[PDB]
């Protein structure tokens, strides 16, 4: 198609089969289809643990820096990958979500302790 407007973006293009996802990191005009015309492939992401239990990310950090220097935006999933690698700072919502999970597990632990205390009262009743 002959696009009018838009910008270059670095995003994940979904490949693979059903229940077997696999991503290609690519630089593409934002208006193009998710798996369609792209400008350059900048790596790959395999989200399924391998035999060694490792999720494998490949990043062409030399070309990634080139396209960020030319105005390429970044998708939020790609910003999370760059933060986990250490190439970018951790994304604000990566930290907030980790804090929300901590507060939610603290409640669960407290509720289990209260239930155990309630169970202890049942033990006292015998």
């Amino acid at each position: 198609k002959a696009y009018h407007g838009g910008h270059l973006t670095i995003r994940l293009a979904l490949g693979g089969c059903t229940n077997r996802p696999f991503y290609r990191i690519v630089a593409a005009h934002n208006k193009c289809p998710r798996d369609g015309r792209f400008v350059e492939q900048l790596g790959s992401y395999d989200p399924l643990p391998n035999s060694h239990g490792e999720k494998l990310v490949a990043l062409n950090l030399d070309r990634i820096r080139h396209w960020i220097g030319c105005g390429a935006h970044l998708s939020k999933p790609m910003e999370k990958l760059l933060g986990l690698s250490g190439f970018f700072p951790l994304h604000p919502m990566m930290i907030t979500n980790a804090e929300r999970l901590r507060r939610r597990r603290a409640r669960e632990v407290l509720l289990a302790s209260q239930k155990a205390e309630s169970e202890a009262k049942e033990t006292e009743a015998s």
Binding site: E99, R102, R103, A106, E108
Partner: protein, 34 residues
Amino acid sequence: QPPERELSRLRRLYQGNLLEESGPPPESMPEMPT
């Protein structure tokens, strides 16, 4: 921890659609209950 004046500024801006204030999160990840 946000300054107390800043927490009040947000309670005025979003008056009527507020949630319970959250304190500092646990220092470590609480061990998963099992």
